[PDB]
Ligand binder design. Structure first.
Ligand SMILES: *[C@@H]1O[C@H](CO)[C@@H](O[C@@H]2O[C@H](CO)[C@@H](O[C@H]3O[C@H](CO)[C@@H](O)[C@H](O)[C@@H]3O)[C@H](O)[C@H]2NC(C)=O)[C@H](O)[C@H]1NC(C)=O
Ligand SMILES: OC[C@H]1O[C@H](O[C@H]2[C@H](O)[C@@H](O)[C@H](O)O[C@@H]2CO)[C@H](O)[C@@H](O)[C@@H]1O
Length: 361
């Protein structure tokens, strides 16, 4: 089993204990660590933060302690406009340029591969995403003739049916990618005025209306679409999604006024790190959807849908029974990396819970 963990660039700026550098990453925790978000500039891969070449270096020294570790650099991301990828992909001149620029960059900084995080290709992009992958992998084969090891190529793919039908030729791209991370955790959108969980494992009862918004469906769907099971990796989140209630209704379907208030460290409307959730639990009422097999909580007018040790071990067992390649954890820096926020004694409680199940057969 593979355990793919993303580390985010901007987490260094978090205040106090929230600050996180590659430094804190247990090198024996994951099989692949993905340094998150390289920019693309002048149609060539490039850094994003002023000190990336330093953190790049910091992350890859982890490999000196665990020579089995594999690292990748993700290009694209949530603050990299999708129209920008589009321009690059749909114009072969600029596409060959981006591709030719990649190997040297990775080799120079000690990475073992590239992760494409084109956040959502549209109807008019499908044919092009396929070319980018096909050609990018082709370039990777050639570059291995130099006697060095073949660089790995991966993609972070939407787990929403409409999104999947719209922009990906999964039968094609999966025959060329080394693995595919299914973004199975951003299901309840950014658009409802109703309370819901962003990562149910299963479908459930109250949900007679939005039927394919759970991990089980996404998986089954990728599978019948042509993706081999051993190239599929199911994303497990380490963050929670908050909501500010509009009535004293705490249960299923209650109305909301908007996203939840910002975490003291994470400073961002609608999102809380698991370590922020851990502090949030004291004084909160914890509930758990039996159907979807995921928990949520409430205090005053704050409703939080998150993942805990149990639900994460569950998603992990599922992944094993359907025989997937492994799990992906979004944000090593959103988990309790210091291990001094969540009561239990461990470092990275959530990610460790996944490793344990992956390792137990
Ligand atoms: C990611 O790459 C982006 C390039 O695709 C880049 O945005 C752009 O480049 C700079 C901003 O850094 C802006 O500025 C200009 O610099 C020249 C050099 O002196 C000036 O003579 C010109 O006035 C020019 O405008 C660009 O306007 C901007 N636009 C584009 C289309 O690239 C970002 O800087 C990169 N993002 C990060 C976070 O590093
Ligand atoms: O630089 C990109 C931004 O990434 C985050 O966004 C949420 C994302 O919108 C959601 O789809 C995903 O499931 O989780 C991440 C949590 O990391 C950051 O919260 C932003 O601060 C970043 O700017």
């Amino acid at each position: 089993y593979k355990l793919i963990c993303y580390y985010t660039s901007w987490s260094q700026y978090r205040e106090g204990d929230g600050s996180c550098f590659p430094d804190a990453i247990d090198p024996f925790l994951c099989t692949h660590v993905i340094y998150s978000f390289a920019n693309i500039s002048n149609n060539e891969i490039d850094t994003w933060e002023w000190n990336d070449v330093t953190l790049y270096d910091t992350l890859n020294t982890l490999k000196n302690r665990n020579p089995k570790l594999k690292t990748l650099l993700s290009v694209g991301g949530w603050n990299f406009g999708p129209e920008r990828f589009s321009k690059i992909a749909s114009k072969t001149q600029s596409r060959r340029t981006f591709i030719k620029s990649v190997p040297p960059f990775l080799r120079t900084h000690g990475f073992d591969g590239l992760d494409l995080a084109w956040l959502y290709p549209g109807r008019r992009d499908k044919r092009h995403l396929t070319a980018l992958v096909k050609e990018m992998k082709a370039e990777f084969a050639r570059e291995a003739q130099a006697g060095t090891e073949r660089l790995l190529l991966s993609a972070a793919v939407s787990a929403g049916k409409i999104a999947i039908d719209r922009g990906y030729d999964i039968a094609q791209i999966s025959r060329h990618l080394d693995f595919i991370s299914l973004l199975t955790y951003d299901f309840h959108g950014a658009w409802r005025q109703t309370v819901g969980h962003h990562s149910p494992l299963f479908r459930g009862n109250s949900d007679a209306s939005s039927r394919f918004s759970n991990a089980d469906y996404a998986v089954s769907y990728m599978l019948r679409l042509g993706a081999p099971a051993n190239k599929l990796v199911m994303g497990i989140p380490t963050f929670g999604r908050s909501f500010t209630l509009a009535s004293s209704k705490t249960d299923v379907g209650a109305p909301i006024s908007g996203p939840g208030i910002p975490g003291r460290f994470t400073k961002e409307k609608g999102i809380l790190a698991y370590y922020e959730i851990c502090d949030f639990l004291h004084g909160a009422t914890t509930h758990r959807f039996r159907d979807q097999q995921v928990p949520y909580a409430t205090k005053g007018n704050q409703w939080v849908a998150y993942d805990d040790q149990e639900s994460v071990k569950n998603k992990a067992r599922y992944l094993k029974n359907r025989q997937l390649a492994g799990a992906m954890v979004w944000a090593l820096d959103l988990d309790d990396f210091r291990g001094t926020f969540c009561g239990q004694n461990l470092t990275f409680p959530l990610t460790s819970a996944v490793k344990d199940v992956l390792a137990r057969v």
